[PDB]
Amino acid sequence: IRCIGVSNRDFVEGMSGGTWVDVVLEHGGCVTVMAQDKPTVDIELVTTTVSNMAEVRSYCYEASISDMASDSRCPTQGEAYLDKQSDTQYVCKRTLVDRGWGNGCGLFGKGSLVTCAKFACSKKMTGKSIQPENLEYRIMLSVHGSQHSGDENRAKVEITPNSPRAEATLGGFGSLGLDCEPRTGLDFSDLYYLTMNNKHWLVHKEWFHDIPLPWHAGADTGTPHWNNKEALVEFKDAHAKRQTVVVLGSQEGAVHTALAGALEAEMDGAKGRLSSGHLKCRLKMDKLRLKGVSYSLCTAAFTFTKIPAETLHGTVTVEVQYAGTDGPCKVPAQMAVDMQTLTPVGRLITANPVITESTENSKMMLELDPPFGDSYIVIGVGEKKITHHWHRSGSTIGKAFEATVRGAKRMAVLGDTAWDFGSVGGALNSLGKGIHQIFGAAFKSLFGGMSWFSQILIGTLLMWLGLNTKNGSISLMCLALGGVLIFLSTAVSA
Amino acid sequence: YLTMNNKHWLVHKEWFHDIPLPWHAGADTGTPHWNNKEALVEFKDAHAKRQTVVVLGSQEGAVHTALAGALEAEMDGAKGRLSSGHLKCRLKMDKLRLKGV
Amino acid sequence: SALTQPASVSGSPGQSITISCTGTSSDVGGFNYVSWFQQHPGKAPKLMLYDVTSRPSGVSSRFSGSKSGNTASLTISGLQAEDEADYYCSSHTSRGTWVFGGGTKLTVL
Amino acid sequence: AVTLPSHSTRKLQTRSQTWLESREYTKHLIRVENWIFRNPGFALAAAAIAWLLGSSTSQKVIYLVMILLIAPAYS
Amino acid sequence: AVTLPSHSTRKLQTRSQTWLESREYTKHLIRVENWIFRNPGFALAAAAIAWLLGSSTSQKVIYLVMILLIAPAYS
């Protein structure tokens, strides 16, 4: 449910003796989790809302110059004054006009004038900043069961950094009870919202503290005192004819152009809303229980409502009428390589498939993975039943192999803080985590500095080293790194 | 000869044809037909579902940055005063007189 | 646009009726979006469809939907007689707008 | 102006698509190209220069890559 | 957007003041510097890489100049 077909979706192995699991989830894809006849449930990131934001500095991406004037004092009259260099927002750059008799002065040479034109601003971009507090998630829940389109099996969980556990209660069976870790999110305390006009996107505290434009500090009451100003308002002159004070236009195309790595947000009335986090909330179980595990087997006709489906993530989804017999019964289904039915192979991704209630048709939609061959979905009546033929694709290592690239991107984007999908490695994961946490530092720093075409060439170059070197220490180097880089390139969105 | 709002510039054809903007053909208006349009708008599809159309906003100033080293130029209706420049001339002194020698 | 739906019909109680709505590939064919909206004359319309075959819970299980190619068929049987509410078929087009069929005056004799 | 920072020297790695990831890379390459399309001469000079350092064959080519790449981008 | 051409690849040579000749030539340099002040690590990696090519001493330093200048600008 709401997790079927969305792709981008890993399915977890199971509880494995802990009544507990480590699942990382993010705005897209879900994670369906099935363990030991506990109802199968899936949860998406949805929207991580940040509210209650400050303003750390500002930039004026536009400029309005005004008021000009000029100095014109002669040579060896010393300096020209013009009083505006006293007042605060009037930019001045002193230049030397080699000055002749036209102007009229005694000597000839550098004449020392500056036009001070009064700066002004319009439409500043605010650097609004956030901290882990006043953050939030609003995770959603699935629990296939039997539904289609709709509490019972969908419970939303607000999750804050100050209350990182979810008490999530479901009609008909027990709560899920997930315990989040919102405090290490996606390296926060480094994203500060950046507002230009009616659009918003995160940027770190390096691209954002590196901008040449004017500073402005915290707030705009009245009109602010603009730090810097040299970047806009560039004025110089030749032929020694006064001064040309240039506005330098607006920089929206520049800042838009200068931000290629910035996750775009959407923001309404504070409530700064986001999109692509990765959250650790680790599902606790043993509070989950199948609904109506008995219900006899429930028997009657079945008619496929819709021609069933095939997901891209190895699934077949089926809806069934059950032709109207009894109440809250239970109807089985099998994947049968043999005969119409017979032996059951493959696996039901949904568990305890059940009819809801009462009159005529109640549709039971069922996530099923056929075997790697081609079977015959079976609907469950001992005798009278409709069926199909599903021809799922591949050669073991066929799809299990691709698995080897999805896992690559699993901890390609997420990094090693993505080892957790796999639950309770304990003495073992530590090896996986301790390996790249020691490595996550170096690589994050050595080529942390690198971008996409950057790490392509550096990748190629190091590879070209790894082939021609001496014996030993660098005999294996490239495959230890250059491959890593050219992979992180082809990874991510790919 | 290159116009913006008021300040006018001089630039290479080699530079001026290479600008990544939705060129126009400048023949006439009436219904300006914008070639490209792709460069200045960007379609950002959200990863989970759907697609957004997003402007790149005014690129104006960035074009000022790209003009580093132009010529500073002044215009009027029928000319556009051109500063800078250089001339070559053979100055013929044949006909002159010291006046009241 | 304007979903083709035929003007009106009738029959003995209990007898099957089928009102078929014919759209194009733009909407009814390339989508599972359908709705049949029982509109009691004088009152507000209501739901009697939801994603074709299925039904809202307060629906008389009488009703049955179906689709082939471009079609929408609301087939009713076991008529309780007092169930003529102008039937309008409506669907979500591909362009992101909804269109409501010409409607079927239902004739109860 | 001369806004220096290119946020891609940092970016952020996440499931969802970043701002101009596509427009970005193709762009980096298409900049270099119609740089060199307008100055084949510098391909000559860069050629002779690079082939004059290193004596070792291939790095020669590494010098050509370094020089062809730095001329248009920074400078 | 991301207008590629920087007119200085041609400029024009005249006694008169070009547009942004001053803030030009430097904003090149000051772009490289913070870019380097924000990624000392890449100075380490670039160091080891360069010093592994050419064996010739001063060729090495050319490689580090090669690479330190290529990273911030030309991606």
From Swiss-Prot, chains D, E:
Residue ranges, Cytoplasmic side: 55-59
Transmembrane portions of the chain: 35-54, 60-75
Subcellular location: Virion membrane; Host endoplasmic reticulum membrane
Membrane topology according to the record: Multi-pass membrane protein
Domain notes: The transmembrane domain contains an endoplasmic reticulum retention signal.
Function description: May play a role in virus budding. Exerts cytotoxic effects by activating a mitochondrial apoptotic pathway through M ectodomain. May display a viroporin activity.
Name by which UniProt lists this protein: Small envelope protein M
UniProt source species: Zika virus (isolate ZIKV/Human/French Polynesia/10087PF/2013)
Parent sequence residues shown: 216 to 290 of 3423
